[PDB]
Amino acid sequence: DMRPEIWIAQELRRXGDEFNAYYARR
Amino acid sequence: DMRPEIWIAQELRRXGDEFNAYYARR
Amino acid sequence: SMSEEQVAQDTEEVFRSYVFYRHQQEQEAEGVAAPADPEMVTLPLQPSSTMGQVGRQLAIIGDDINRRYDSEFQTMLQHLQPTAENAYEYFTKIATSLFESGINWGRVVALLGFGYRLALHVYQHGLTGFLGQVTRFVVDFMLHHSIARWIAQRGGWVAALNLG
Amino acid sequence: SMSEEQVAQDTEEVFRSYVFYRHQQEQEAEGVAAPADPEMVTLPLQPSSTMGQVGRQLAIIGDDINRRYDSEFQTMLQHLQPTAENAYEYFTKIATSLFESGINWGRVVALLGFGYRLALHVYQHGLTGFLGQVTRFVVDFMLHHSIARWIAQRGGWVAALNLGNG
Ligand SMILES: [N+]
């Protein structure tokens, strides 16, 4: 499947990129 | 690997059980 | 008195209303990530339906809990890769597993939520008109796997209005 | 007037303020059902300091976004099984992975969020005093892996003061 630390990194990136777009849209 | 439908069912169950515990009678 | 057949019939309006009002409130969320599904935005509903009330209420009171699972269901559905061709098979396996260790109201509502999330996935991957198919997935599973009977014996879907 | 070294020094207060305000807002939320972490409630902090304000800005803006990751992070951290002994290296490698394809302010905030979630998970699983360890994970990652210099070239942490207020 995936090591948990790789999975966490992938989801932190998704989440961070959603924050990044939110700061700009605001 | 756990089959994907099994993982989904496990988390559906967890989610449902969280709802069930939160909205308990009295 | 409330029969499993009446619960099965009521479930269609419960689910369709649940989908409409869940989508409505989610599309109002700050930082919402899922795009709008016009089939759910324009979904027509019966204006005075008690069952419509039930589905709306379940969507509303479930919002805090359900949204906490959003990212995980994105990951899980990307792995499952459901399509029109395998949706019945996987819906049935998932619903069966959901209730294997017992039935409770939260799991009943989670089945609705799964139907919602599956319908969104299929629309977002290109297929229109699938909401009627998932609606029947939900109703038929409940009728034939004793969930409608379970609800009936606890007063029917209006019993859900006492939750919270 | 800004340097990578200064940004790294400032990061400790930014992160500790972020932790305080994130915990406070989550404990105040209505549905919640989330157990309090007293180490995060009694954090000594100067709210009106500039770095205190930066941490607050980053905690309060768009907090609905990190709610959507709550259940997945429960699952993932249970699989990670962090400990006092393994967490520094896990944190550093996760952070390296996060920024491999680029640095942006949202990913910076996600790193703070991971520090928060990791600190909260480890406390709830019985280890006190771990917040000081996670704080250094965050600071030391930024110092030694480009992030503090990236922030410094953009004016320092004060450049984050108004993110999301357009
Ligand atoms: N697995």
Side-chain angles (χ1 to χ4, degrees), chain C residues 66-143:
Chain C
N66 294 338
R67 67 184 181 162
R68 283 197 277 283
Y69 286 86
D70 274 2
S71 78
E72 194 177 43
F73 272 87
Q74 294 307 291
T75 299
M76 290 185 301
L77 288 173
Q78 176 77 3
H79 276 16
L80 181 67
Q81 286 298 315
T83 66
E85 280 69 23
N86 63 30
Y88 178 79
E89 170 196 346
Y90 283 137
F91 180 96
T92 304
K93 289 177 175 183
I94 288 163
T96 301
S97 187
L98 169 59
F99 294 106
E100 188 180 22
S101 65
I103 303 169
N104 71 64
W105 276 112
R107 290 179 187 188
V108 167
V109 174
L111 189 63
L112 305 181
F114 183 60
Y116 170 82
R117 288 193 186 272
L118 177 61
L120 264 182
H121 182 98
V122 173
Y123 175 82
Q124 282 166 354
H125 288 74
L127 183 61
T128 62
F130 187 70
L131 200 45
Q133 297 172 258
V134 174
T135 300
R136 299 310 310 168
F137 288 173
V138 175
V139 177
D140 294 336
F141 179 91
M142 292 192 37
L143 180 61

Side-chain angles (χ1 to χ4, degrees), chain A residues 22, chain C residues 24-33 63 67, chain D residues 64 68:
Chain A
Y22 182 83
Chain C
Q24 186 178 73
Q25 71 198 2
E26 292 185 352
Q27 289 290 303
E28 285 161 8
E30 208 71 8
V32 54
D63 180 52
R67 67 184 181 162
Chain D
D64 285 289
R68 283 189 283 101

Side-chain angles (χ1 to χ4, degrees), chain B residues 2-15:
Chain B
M2 172 187 298
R3 287 293 322 279
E5 67 270 16
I6 302 301
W7 179 24
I8 291 172
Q10 183 172 334
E11 287 300 276
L12 265 192
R13 211 160 46 248
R14 192 162 76 84

